[PDB]
Design a binder for this molecule. Structure first.
Ligand SMILES: Nc1nc2c(ncn2[C@@H]2O[C@H](COP(=O)(O)OP(=O)(O)O)[C@@H](OP(=O)(O)OP(=O)(O)O)[C@H]2O)c(=O)[nH]1
Ligand SMILES: Nc1nc2c(ncn2[C@@H]2O[C@H](COP(=O)(O)OP(=O)(O)O)[C@@H](OP(=O)(O)OP(=O)(O)O)[C@H]2O)c(=O)[nH]1
Ligand SMILES: Nc1nc2c(ncn2[C@@H]2O[C@H](COP(=O)(O)OP(=O)(O)O)[C@@H](OP(=O)(O)OP(=O)(O)O)[C@H]2O)c(=O)[nH]1
Ligand SMILES: Nc1ncnc2c1ncn2[C@@H]1O[C@H](COP(=O)(O)OP(=O)(O)OP(=O)(O)O)[C@@H](O)[C@H]1O
Ligand SMILES: Nc1ncnc2c1ncn2[C@@H]1O[C@H](COP(=O)(O)OP(=O)(O)OP(=O)(O)O)[C@@H](O)[C@H]1O
Ligand SMILES: Nc1ncnc2c1ncn2[C@@H]1O[C@H](COP(=O)(O)OP(=O)(O)OP(=O)(O)O)[C@@H](O)[C@H]1O
Ligand SMILES: [Mg+2]
Ligand SMILES: [Mg+2]
Ligand SMILES: [Mg+2]
Ligand SMILES: [Mg+2]
Ligand SMILES: [Mg+2]
Ligand SMILES: [Mg+2]
Lengths: 464, 464, 464, 108
């Protein structure tokens, strides 16, 4: 009658929690070559990624640059919400218009604009020119950075530097082959698109073709623009932020909380699903049990994020005593979400590509990457050089001494993190590990990897 | 109903994997003295070793020298395939002609051969002379290294240095006693063997008797030549390699793959078994489960090799998340192989002789030794002297500065491995540990050791 | 002819530099008890301290609180200049009015002042009440914190809470004994001082007597107010800052530069000496040679500060390769300053009280303490509790999640420094060490300690 | 700065520039860090462990980044030395004086 671990209640200790280090993938019959394995997976019930990886929406991980890089790599990025609503909406706009985003609503300047303003717009959107539209609304010309390369006077108006009409243009609904043919024939890099009245409706640049060739796995929406997600909280400021982000063109809204088994979080999810659910996917916060995942599914979430204190040495585990091992948590969440076809996102605890393979085999559909991507080039922060090494830092007015020691050392030296380089190499290494796991387990797709079996190892299997 | 580790499927976590550190051998009733225990075991269904150890077929472990040493020690060597087909066939031929291999097809030279060519052949085959056969095909004499010891001019032909006929010869089918008596009577070290018509058919040297007395446990084929195995891959190049190796006289072909539960590997095994299966034994690649071992047995493999990611901190376990603890894998593989009499080779994860005893007690017939033999003298590599120690390395044209620092330090200092000495001492230590285990468990033979019992130990049993 | 260290110029290597670890103080004939040694010394040619220690004028060391504590301990503090001119002048005013500073120019309030503003003034000046003066200029009452202890409504005007006139007052020029007698007789803690016409001229509080009894070594000016110094740079902003500080009531101005052997620094020192030299003492920046000290003396400096890269592992020594060992630098600076009676301040390189004794025996008159005082309670920074220990830190809007991990850890954990406790204990330990040194060397005064002899030790004397 | 003050006119830089982007060698990514390496035919197995690790992981050196940043840091240190010694030109820095320190001056 007594429980072997103490007491009389057999459900006081609910279960035995397994972490990533407790299990290994068992080899199975395999006709799968790692180079031909298909790693595409569902992020939500309507969005499918070519690479099942998402950035972690932390202030040190994901901004517009990281979102663009992740969308190009085949995954997606989620913008963090530790900033004003206007800044987050502007970052969403930057991601949406980065690549093949000027086809329908192009950015234009006026003939009275100075060269500095045009250069600022070009630097923000990473484009090399803009069409010029006057007060009447007529396409009067185009101004590119070949026109303003050597202009010393940056206060000069656009009208003195632009290339006047007529321009080489295309009709609405012009195919990519015809546009490329025009660009090759006239040896230009830009092609405005006008309607029957000769009024500007879009712009095609050589950047579109270059990026399509260079990044064949890019994640795009129906209009051909890069996908991006954004995080929101709970409350009224959260509602205003979510509405502003939806207006800016976000594709995924993540109700990001540490403990989503709360009435407020579920109410926010239901409200968002009812208000903008026809346009935007809604992802629920972090839930580590089956009941919480079922509650989020009932509230109408399109995807469920799992991790609640998954790290072994974690602040939640030490200060609060609350936690859940990640493998068991994913298993329970999948046991609640799978009958309704709701994807599961693993979040936290991942240190290697083997952990990603284990998380996907436990039943999750995507994995969210945090500290793995913190030091990359596309992550926020400034690159500094200290003691013969590169670091990334997150860094005078009254110190006018030219020979002071603070002048001899770089700024931001305190609080720096190692520099990891480009994001593409990290993503490629992770994808190679995942493909090796798929080849070992005989999984042609991720949906077949989700049916792979585990072997539990003892402590002796973790010894150096 | 719910699984205690998570989810609803009770087969998601298939089993608990035990490694070598998790178990110990239980003493049983024993009348066995370690000095008299019989350690002979089956390598395949037709080949029996006196010492149940095999080399690992890695480019840093097994070449012709290691194969010869392992065969003399009582085990066998498997040649690595990271080299051209002609080179691997040449190494097979070198092993096959090292000891008592000239009795039926001796190596011969011609009077037109220079002394340099004869010296090269003698250095390759480790013989001290050759019979001489002219264009017409008569045995005209013998050339040994006592004849060419002081010849300063190495371009001198054989005819100017050889000892002319008549020679002391013996008839075909001469017993060892008669040949030794002739050698003792005439006080020579070589004895050609001729047919009734006086044509050369073989050669006996004192090396045969010396090696027979020195190495009583040598592994030999039907003709008394040393046993050797070779590794092949999968594909058309692999088929050509296998055919060339069989022509060279290989005894065992090992289809060495990382994951043998693949249709291509099984097809290769079946093709080899149908083509050269009447002459050569075929060993399947590495398999960690019962189903894979059963598939290899059905395909026609003569032996099954097991280890798939057996190391605790392993590249397969960290990058792909795939692995299987070795004790459980051996148990499952034996559960599939034993009813058909197919031997099991335990490959990987062995660090001590206790691990070898545990692997043999788990049901395996032989153990394959890897990094334990990487630094021995017979392993490939160059011996260097660095900082008062001996190391083995795996290592000018435009650096003509005679006082440069690169002249002051040995080449290959970077990337060296410790030197281990002769292989025989290592094999003797491992065999002594195995004999002690056999004495403790009361096992007169390896087949009785395979019925020994284990005790599972906790984490506290591994603490220093 | 050649120099043994290289070259032909015997002055290329000018001298051998001795640091603190290279020398020890030799015991001499002593009739001195450590408890009776006199540690008073000259800071400048007109200012004498009771304890020859000065705070280091760094933004982590000296602000108004540290300056007050240092003045009470018997030394002095120099306010850092890494802040706006108005803030530094406010800190000067706070220090000057802390203790016995209302005797001639008291802080007053008007009857229309709210209780919040009076409370803010009392908190700034560390007083427990203010006299009230109307628009006409008459002393109408006094408001103390016993009157407003339980006034929950902090917007209440002073007129509703003050103790109305007539008050217990004393005539101008009242002796301290008479004021204390009045305070004892009427059992109050405050005594306004009025002239013959009944107009408010000053204020005496029990704080004056309490602090005089508690801190008998306090450094005071002619008016009986605590001494304070401030740092200024070079330039026009520096001139405005210096004029504002002199108007605020500063006593010492320190021209704080890393390399004071510059024409700009000397010109600034000369200008300050010409303009405000009758009221304020001017101390020159850091100089490490005899010629630089002579230049500062000629420019008209009242004291000369020495240290230029005195630390063994220092940023100046590593990045620039420039430095000077502190003992030799002090010897040279004293050799240039002593004939004119200009005191020397040893700045940098001090780690123990033995180093302070060595610096004073080398000829310096005062020592400037930096990192020794960084972690004390009176130094700038905020006290935090982390992992069972007290630390000092030098430190939300959008993180509204109540269960996030940033809510679980204290703010300022990054970049924290250890807590050292009260300043008085550190000063007392250093003074005890200095007194022990004086007793060993037989020096009744610091001027006698400046004539002590050294013994030079070898490397073997520094071995553990 | 010390070498130029002793009388040398130029300095030659070796290991300080070994791992920069412009130095010879290939950039590799190992264990979350960038390295520079100075690096199959018969290993056609697709699931082998040598396929799971990059080639050249052994014998690698840390990556330093662009050369311009290193040169700028060195020149800044030299300019600080010139400002301390009062040398407007390198020829005046060659007339600077030294002070000899003892062993105690090298202890942390
Ligand atoms: N004015 C301006 N232009 C910038 C700036 N940064 C990037 N660009 C331009 O943006 C276009 C694409 O930027 P990329 O660097 O290729 O791509 P990215 O979106 O990953 O940053 C290029 O012109 P392109 O003509 O599309 O390509 P190409 O002619 O260089 O091949 C490039 O010159 C900037 O700060 N100011
Ligand atoms: N020409 C030539 N001969 C070589 C060379 N290396 C070894 N030999 C000869 O090969 C024979 C056997 O070689 P061992 O060293 O005993 O054996 P191994 O096969 O283990 O290497 C010896 O002659 P033996 O007459 O059989 O033995 P013994 O008279 O030395 O006892 C030895 O002299 C070489 O580079 N060149
Ligand atoms: N209103 C107000 N008063 C403050 C504040 N902080 C300190 N005081 C008062 O200042 C006087 C002296 O402050 P202390 O703390 O003794 O000295 P300090 O200058 O070293 O800080 C005290 O009143 P006392 O009457 O001089 O001394 P006692 O009656 O407490 O002995 C104390 O109550 C504050 O934030 N607000
Ligand atoms: N559609 C167009 N019709 C006519 N002229 C055009 C058109 N697009 C660009 N031009 C003009 O052609 C010139 C170069 O065009 P393009 O856009 O290829 O240059 P760019 O991107 O600035 O070049 P670079 O990348 O070398 O700096 C500029 O003077 C530009 O104004
Ligand atoms: N069967 C034989 N009949 C006749 N002469 C022989 C025969 N075998 C060897 N000889 C000759 O006898 C001499 C020595 O023979 P043996 O083979 O014993 O020498 P070896 O092996 O060269 O000696 P070592 O190992 O001491 O250098 C040589 O001149 C050799 O040619
Ligand atoms: N000179 C004075 N003449 C008349 N009344 C006075 C005088 N000084 C103070 N008082 C009044 O006497 C009361 C107490 O005075 P006192 O200054 O001793 O108190 P306090 O410093 O506020 O006390 P505590 O330190 O206990 O809070 C207050 O109501 C105050 O207004
Ligand atoms: Mg361009
Ligand atoms: Mg271009
Ligand atoms: Mg011989
Ligand atoms: Mg011999
Ligand atoms: Mg009081
Ligand atoms: Mg009181």
């Amino acid at each position: 009658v007594p429980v072997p671990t103490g007491g009389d209640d057999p459900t006081k200790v609910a279960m035995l929690g397994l972490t990533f280090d407790d299990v290994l993938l068992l080899p199975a019959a395999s006709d799968v070559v790692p180079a031909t394995a298909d790693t595409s997976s569902q992020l939500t019930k309507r969005i499918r990624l070519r690479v099942p990886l998402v950035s972690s929406a932390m202030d040190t991980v994901t901004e517009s640059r990281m979102a663009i890089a992740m969308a190009r790599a085949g995954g997606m990025g989620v913008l963090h919400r530790n900033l004003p609503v206007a800044e987050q909406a502007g970052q969403v706009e930057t991601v949406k218009r980065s690549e093949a985003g000027m086809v329908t609503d192009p950015v234009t300047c006026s003939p009275d604009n100075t060269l500095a303003e045009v250069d600022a717009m070009c630097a923000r959107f990473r484009i090399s020119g803009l069409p010029v539209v006057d007060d009447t609304g007529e396409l009067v010309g185009i101004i590119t950075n070949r026109d303003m390369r050597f202009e010393v006077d940056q206060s000069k108006p656009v009208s003195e530097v632009m290339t006047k009409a007529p321009l080489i243009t295309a009709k609405e609904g012009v195919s990519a082959e015809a546009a490329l043919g025009l660009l090759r024939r006239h040896k230009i890099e830009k092609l405005p698109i006008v309607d029957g009245h000769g009024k500007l409706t879009g712009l095609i640049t050589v950047k579109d073709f270059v990026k399509t060739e260079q990044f064949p796995l890019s994640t795009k929406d129906s209009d051909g623009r890069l996908l991006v997600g954004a995080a929101v909280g709970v409350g009224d400021d959260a509602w205003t932020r979510a509405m502003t982000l939806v207006d800016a063109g976000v594709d995924v809204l993540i109700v990001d909380t540490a403990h989503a088994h709360n009435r407020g979080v579920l109410d926010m999810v239901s409200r968002l699903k009812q208000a903008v659910g026809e346009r935007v996917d809604v992802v629920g916060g972090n839930v580590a049990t089956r009941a919480a995942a079922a509650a989020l599914v009932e509230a109408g979430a399109d995807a469920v994020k799992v991790g609640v204190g998954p790290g072994s040495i974690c602040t939640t585990r030490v200060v609060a005593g609350v936690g859940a091992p990640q493998i068991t948590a994913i298993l329970e969440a999948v046991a609640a979400c799978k009958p309704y076809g709701v994807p599961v996102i693993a979040d936290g605890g991942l240190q290697y590509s083997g952990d990603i393979a284990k998380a996907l085999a436990a039943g999750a559909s995507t994995a969210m990457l945090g500290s793995l991507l913190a030091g990359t080039a596309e992550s926020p922060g400034e690159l500094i050089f200290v003691n013969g090494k590169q670091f990334k830092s997150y860094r005078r007015y009254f110190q006018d001494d030219v020979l002071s020691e603070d002048k001899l050392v770089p700024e931001g030296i305190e609080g720096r993190v190692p520099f990891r380089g480009p994001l593409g190499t990290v993503i490629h290494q992770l994808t190679g590990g995942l493909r090796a796991a798929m080849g070992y387990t005989g999984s042609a797709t991720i949906e077949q990897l989700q049916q792979a079996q585990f072997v539990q190892i003892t402590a002796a299997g973790l010894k150096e």
